[PDB]
Amino acid sequence: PLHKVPVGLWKQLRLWEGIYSRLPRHYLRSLEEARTPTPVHYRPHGAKFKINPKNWQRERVEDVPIPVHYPPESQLGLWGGEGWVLGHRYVNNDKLSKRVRKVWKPQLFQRELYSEILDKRFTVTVTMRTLDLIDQACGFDFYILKTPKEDLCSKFGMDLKRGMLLRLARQDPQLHPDDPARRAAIYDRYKAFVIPEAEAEWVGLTLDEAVEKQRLLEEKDPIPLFKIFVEELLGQLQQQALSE
Amino acid sequence: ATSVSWKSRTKYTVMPVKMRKSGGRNHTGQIQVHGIGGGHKQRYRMIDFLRFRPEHESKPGPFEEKVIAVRYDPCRSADIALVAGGNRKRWIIATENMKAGDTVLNSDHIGRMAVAAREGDAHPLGALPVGTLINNVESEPGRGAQYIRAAGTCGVLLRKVNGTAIIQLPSKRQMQVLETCIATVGRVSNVDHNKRVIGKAGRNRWLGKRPNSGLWQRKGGWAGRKIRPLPPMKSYVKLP
């Protein structure tokens, strides 16, 4: 026998059925789309066509992303969207020589980054590319709010983004209870990323966390049948009272 | 399975505690050091290597203790000595001529005049004469006597310059430390320990030394009389 639905669509079917269907539509549509992350380790070519130097003919070239491995320690820091490059290499850079497995690893650094919206200094394991992206975005909070999930590749970064988005959507007075002017000045410069509360609490959540949150939201105690029967009897009595 | 260490005892006690030997096996269970295992059952007598340790912090001055008994210790090659002062007793490493019913001084005071060095006495290096034989010397003030402890071994004080004392270890190497490091004077007990003669191959098994491997290995370049110069003086002073 054969399966009616291919194995590649089984996860999609489970996401469509069950409690996964009751999840918010904006979260679902954010999870479905798989955007190609920015090239970090492989250098892409600009144009889509290229002239072969040997064939002297135009051919369509494409970019294939190089698989990069993210160890579980990367989810606790901000490595800038990079990780471990596991692959092979030719010793002495000769094809006809030996093939050798090689693991290229990034240079991690324990740096302390200060956030303006959350007002806390986090001791995070960041990379030089992370610091460069921060300097390019002209701010830690700017970098967090601008780089998406596919470019962060960090659960901690997604949690930071969710926290600052919730703070911006709630206008939290706990930022600076003694400096309302400073709080307002901080909240104004991040106005371009203001997201409503209905979507600000579902951005840095995984599938398991989202299912757990939906279960905690839908967790209702079973009402006793006494209440339902009393309501039915009251309805019947009101009907018999109005039908006379 | 991973084994736990027997050294789980935070409270210092004078009574001997039972210890679980392990023959070359690390906490994993594989041999790390060959030729170890199957010795005699031994207890552990906890030694207090920080000699200058007052009972209460209210009186941090020097103190005198009395030697009760010089006993044998199966864990080290030296002899241990029970010393009592105040309300507590402690095991220390007995010197060459330390007998029962002696008085030992433990001081941390340095003065312009050198003190007369007895055996059981323990003064900082800055207070001892320039040619004094010492043992149980320290690296940092208050760290504890990691250095000379073996039976009969003793170092010698060479000179004191710029509030820093230079000593010479039994390995004929020079060690520079601060002058406030406490050190015990004299030679360690059991000076005839090197002259002992293992009578038979069974005494090694009693001590807990398994026989060497029977594999014949050809000598490499490492073998031969390597006449190397004396290494430079090991300094422990942190110069800013």
């Binding site: 703070r167 966390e209 757990e212 949150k213 | 260490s5 935070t10 290597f49």
Partner: protein, 77 residues
Amino acid sequence: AYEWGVRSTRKPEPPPLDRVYEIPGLEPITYAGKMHFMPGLARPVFPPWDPGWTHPKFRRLPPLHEHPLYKDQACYV
């Protein structure tokens, strides 16, 4: 000096708290609702359990100073 406790035998320190507990104004999503550990969710922090009714055998030993016969002066018995 020389501390008499070995780290591998002492009570190991609690694991570091999850990174979601350092974000101000953010509720952690833990596994406390399912009454069991589940990977991917945060570690819930629980307050010290209060057995509203005391049990003689299964209670913590009261301290020495709580005893009514406790005195400041040390007696040598």
